Each structure stands twice: as structure tokens, then as C-alpha cells.
Ligand binder design. Sequence first.
Ligand code: NAG
Ligand code: NAG
Ligand code: NAG
Lengths: 184, 119, 281, 36, 146
Amino acid sequence: ANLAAFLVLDRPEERITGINDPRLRNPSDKFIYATVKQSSVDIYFRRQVELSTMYRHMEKHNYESAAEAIQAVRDNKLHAFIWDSAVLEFEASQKCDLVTTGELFFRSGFGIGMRKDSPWKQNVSLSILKSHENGFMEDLDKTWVRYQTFENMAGVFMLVAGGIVAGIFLIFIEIAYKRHKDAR
Amino acid sequence: SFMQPFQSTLWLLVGLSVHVVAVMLYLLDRFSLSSAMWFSWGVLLNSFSARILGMVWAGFAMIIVASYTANLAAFLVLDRPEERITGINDPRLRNPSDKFIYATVKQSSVDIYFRRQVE
Amino acid sequence: MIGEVVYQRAVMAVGSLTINEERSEVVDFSVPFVETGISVMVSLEPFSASVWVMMFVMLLIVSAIAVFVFEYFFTIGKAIWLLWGLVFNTTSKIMVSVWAFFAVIFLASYTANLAAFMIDQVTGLSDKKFQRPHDYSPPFRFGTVPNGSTERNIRNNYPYMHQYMTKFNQKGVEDALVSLKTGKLDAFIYDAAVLNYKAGRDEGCKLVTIGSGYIFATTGYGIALQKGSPWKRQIDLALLQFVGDGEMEELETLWLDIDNMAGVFYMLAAAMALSLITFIW
Amino acid sequence: FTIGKAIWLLWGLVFNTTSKIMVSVWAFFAVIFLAS
Amino acid sequence: IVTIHQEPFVYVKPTLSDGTCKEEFTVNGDPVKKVICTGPNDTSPGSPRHTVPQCCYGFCIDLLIKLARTMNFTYEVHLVADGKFGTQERVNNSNKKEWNGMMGELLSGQADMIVAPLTINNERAQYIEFSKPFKYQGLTILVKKE
Ligand SMILES: *[C@@H]1O[C@H](CO)[C@@H](O)[C@H](O)[C@H]1NC(C)=O
Ligand SMILES: *[C@@H]1O[C@H](CO)[C@@H](O)[C@H](O)[C@H]1NC(C)=O
Ligand SMILES: *[C@@H]1O[C@H](CO)[C@@H](O)[C@H](O)[C@H]1NC(C)=O
């Protein structure tokens, strides 16, 4: 029964699906999560008109920067944080103490801002296609995006070790006193 | 499965281990009788060199039986089979399967609903 | 479709075509909507106590201190025998009883760890298997679909690899599927989206790509338009609105033991070593 | 001990000559039942 | 060009006291280009902003250098004063519709190109042209591991 109760009621840490998570549909104040600013996350939230009020309640503020948001999340000030998957997974690779959860939604790629009248759009697009074709871009991505039995059991092992050493230490003098009493 | 689920050679392996520990115990006793097998069976199931070897064999046997019990418990826990349907939303119902036969009676309200939701 | 667009026979055309370097030179297309690329589609310690030595040293030291305390109360004839009997199968019995309790707790924790534990081949083109398929006795027949972005890419990247793949070139899709099912080809190279769809709708889910993120050349699909056609702006704006309104996500959705051998070997080695030591002594 | 010995052994094997094989397989059945 | 400070792609830090930025090597023993990127000293609003030269590097700058070498361009990396992407927002007292951040910098003509991890958006593409994406991804949820 102890094994069953250990395997159940565990610390699964729900992988927070995000847009499909029922617990995120209720804007509970005990679980605070918001974006940084008016950027693409806020654009998507405003564009999604079915739960615009829910998205507004979820945000409830605008953070100064993504670095400050990640620092607050690391300090456990924010329960959850929403941003681009590449940044989150790079942060997770840098520090395993931060984990990325949820599937991929709104798969929109990056881009290069340019004026419409600028004639370099074709050159930039062709250069990007060439880079994707060659291994130079692949190697650059690998260099820049690819990076690097439990606490409870160790703690209980230390506790039982302390208990057994204390027990043998006390039983030593207990048996010494018993022998002295028997052999007066 | 009541018996061993997979890798049924464990019986032969434990028999060979019993034989080798028995002959080793005989050699140790000679360099210190059909009783080594009985001692091994008693070690497996509750009812200087020699004692050390016997206790090491007993530890290995208890580890093996604990692992076997854990495997049996895990196999018993693993049952799944949640009717494999769980409502209309299921991959089996989405793509028809010849092996799994399912249909309605006739051109009833269910048939009309299926025709209306033509996907 | 590219030829149809070239001769002004189709101003606008979408056929889930793969974006390529040469295609942009001849024709133009809007922003991609579905990510795709080149993918590869193929068909005691480990159980519990991975650290092992970390707790083994503690067990050794506690056993040694227990033996010393019992001697203070035979070091090897009595203390060792009792300690090993606490794991097998007067006032001095209190320490024996508590050590037996510790051994029982350890056994229960080991069983719990076993229960908790019980309840790809390549990472892309970096490995030498693709570069040197002849290093193994069975040839690494890859195979590719001709007249395609994948074969164009393998032509542009490696000539010798392209020749080797053309040595086992087939039509693909259906031929690739039947070859993978029958084991004719170890792995096949084709569009990432098609391979993902086949894996999602695979018989028994025995076919799957190599994890995720191992795409050799990630591209998109887009919609091909005629050069100079006054529809690029409207098409891209409408597509971005659709993907921002959740239409793209909605369309995408609803559409597509060994340790026993190690243990017995370890126990046999330990028994042989102990027998040799006793014979020497 | 006839009555005492057999029943005592049967109850002992629940927890942790040629006839030793039979008591061994009975203890195996008992431990299998306990595991189940 | 105006670039937003993002850790995965833009490693913004103050330059060395000599006036330049020290050059190091990666894990595989290759030098990493570190162009001088002038920008505001403090990103907090209501602070004495100073255009001190910072050192920014990463993957986006490498792609920018490759594009410049292929098309004979030049690099003029400068940090955004606002420190945000600068999308469409409601101005005070309903004055007019305009853009801030990098988008506003591009519209005002101060910077004619944006090299930053900015995703493709409908309203962004309404007024600003976007090239083919160099990487495809979809935003996810970040939670502290425990
Ligand atoms: C690159 O730009 C030059 C001048 O703007 C132009 O002549 C050439 O065709 C362009 N090449 C590509 C591939 O866009
Ligand atoms: C193009 O397709 C034809 C048949 O449709 C085939 O014979 C030819 O080999 C293909 N081209 C290449 C380069 O494989
Ligand atoms: C690059 O373009 C510039 C245009 O200002 C030209 O002066 C220079 O010679 C070109 N370099 C090469 C290698 O074509």
C-alpha cells in the first residue's frame, strides 16, 4: 500500500498544454502567467476574439523584458511564462532548472524586416534558401542552438543512516551498562 | 500471465546457478552428501567459506525473487484495454477497419446524422 | 506544376510543393504555412540503483561499524554471518534487529524502484552510415523519390551519395511504404510532412521519423503564383490571418529482463573470486 | 512429529530426504500466492 | 539596422575598456564574430539613456554578416531605445495610429533593415515586407522545473 501511495499522488507537474489546458481557461489568481509586452504573443491574444477578456485577465500587466520575465520565473515569482519556443528551449538547454512544457501551437517562423520598395527582398530570400541548402546554416544552428537517483531517496537514506548510527551509539553504552549490572 | 511472461529460460538459468553453487560448496567442504540442493531450495524458499558462499547465494536468490515479484506486479498492473473506442472521437472510427466490424441497423436517424455529417 | 506556371498556363497554383532555391529564381510564391523539410523515417543498474556504488560504500561502512560494535559487545564468524543473514532469503540482538529492519526497508525500496522503472538509430546525415554505406555487410539502401525537392537537395549536397541512392532509386511513397513494411529498405528519404503523416497513420505505428529537429533542410510549402501577379499581398495577408485565427491549427488537427543476466554474471564472478581467495588462503 | 511437524512446516513456509522437493514446491506455490 | 536584445541570438554586454570587444573561441575552436553594437545604457524607462557602445553577438549577427558578404552590404547594428518589438498600440488620447520599437524605426526610415528574431504576423506584413523565414517554430509555455 505504501508503494501504491508513492506511485500515485506523485509530483507529475502537469505539462500545461497551453491553449487546450482546462486549468488555464479559468483565470485563477493563484496561478499567474503573462507575456512580456505588446509583441506577437499579445497580437495573437487580441486576434483570438473568442476569449479576449480571458487573455486580458491572464496578462494583467506587461513585463519590461524577456530577461526579467525569465528571471522572475526562475525566482518562482511567475507560475508560467509564454514566449517563442526557440528562446524557451535554448534557456532550458543552458539551465536544466528551467523546463519547457506544452506542444507546438501557432507555428509561425521568423523573418527579416524590410521596406516594400527595397529591392533586396529577392536577394535576401535567395540567400536564405541557399543557406538552408548548404551545411553552413546547419552547422551554425548546431553550434548556436544545440547544447547540453533522486533527492528524496538520498535524503531518506541520510536520515536512516543517522538513525542507525545514533541507535548503535546508544546501544553500545546500554549494553555496557547491562553487562556492568550483570557482572557487579 | 500466471507463469513467467517472457524469457522463460530463467528456470534453466537458476537451475544452472544452483548446480554451480552446489559444486562450489562441495569443493569448499572438501577443502574446509546430497544436501547442497536441499540447502539451495531452502534458501530459495523459506521453510568460513561455506557460510559466506551460502549467504551470498541467499542474497542473490532473494534479489532474484524480489525482481520476479516486481515484474509480476507490473505485468498485473499493465492491463490497458479501455474499450479502445472512448466515444465517436477515435482513430479506429475515423479510418474504417475491415477487422473491426461496426454499423447501424438501417436508414434510421443515426444513418441520417451520419449522412449529414459527411466527412 | 512549375512547368504549368512557367508557360502562364496557371497564374496561381498550390500543390503542397516544397520551397527550393531554384524555384524562387523562376517563379514566386507567398510565405509558407506548414513547416516541412527533409526527414529520415526508419522502422541491475539500468533497472534500479543506477548510482550503485554511492549506496554500496555506505552499506560497506555501516556493515564494518556494526561488526566493530558487535566485536566490542567473532568479527567474521559471527558479526558477518548475522549481517548477511539479515538479508539472506540477549541484549546484543537489538542492533541485529534494527539492522534487519534497515535491510527490509532497503529491500522494499529496491522493489519500489523496480516497480517505478517498469511502470533513434541515426541523428541525420552527420553519421558515417550515410557517407559510407559500405562499412557494413548489409548495404544501406536509402532510396529517394525522383523529380523531387529531396533528390534535388541530395544532388546539390553530395554527388557520390546521390549516385548511391540512385543505385536503389524507386518511385517511392507507396513503393517506399511497401519496402519499409517488407524490409526492402532500412530507411527512406522524402518530405518531412509526408513521413510524419505516414507515421501518424502507420499500421501498428512501427514507422516513425528520427525524433524531431533533425531536419536536414527545413523549408515550407507556400502557394505558387505567377511572376508579377498582383495577388501576393492579398494571399499572404489572408494566409497570415488564417494562421493567426487558429484556422491552420484546426485544419492540422483531426486530419492526421536484461538486468537479470548482468546480475547473474556479477554473482557468478563474485562466487568464483571468493572461491579462489578461500583456496589461496 | 506427524501432526505437529507437517502443519508447523506448512505454516512456517507461508512467511519468510526426497520429500524436500514437495515442501519446496508447496513453498513456491505459497510465495506465488503471496505475490499475486 | 536595429536589433532587439534577445539572449539566444543577441548577447548584449558592455565592450572592453580598450574601446573594442574581446574575441573568444567556441567549443570547437572557432572564433565568434563580435561586432560593436551601440545602444542605450539602461533599458528602464525614465533613465539617463546614453549611447554607450555595447558588444552583441550570436547567430543572428552571423547570418547578417553572411548576408552582407553575399550582397556587399554593411553592418550598422544599433540597439532599440524602446527595448521592445514595438507592435501596434493605442496611443494616449487617441491621437493617431503609429508604430514604436523596431517596426516604428523601420517605418521612420532611421533603419532600413531589421535583423531580429521577429516572427511573421498579419498586421506586421500589412505595412512591413517580410522575407522567407530562416527558421520555423511555434510559441510554447515556460514553467519552472520542480
Ligand atoms: C541580387 O541583387 C542584384 C542587384 O540588386 C541583382 O542584380 C541580382 O539579380 C540579385 N540576385 C538575386 C539572387 O536576387
Ligand atoms: C523524372 O521522372 C522520370 C519518369 O517520370 C524518370 O524517368 C526520371 O529519372 C526522373 N528524373 C530524375 C532526375 O530522376
Ligand atoms: C561589392 O559591391 C560593391 C558596391 O558598392 C563593389 O564596390 C564591390 O567591388 C563589390 N565586391 C565584389 C567582391 O563584388
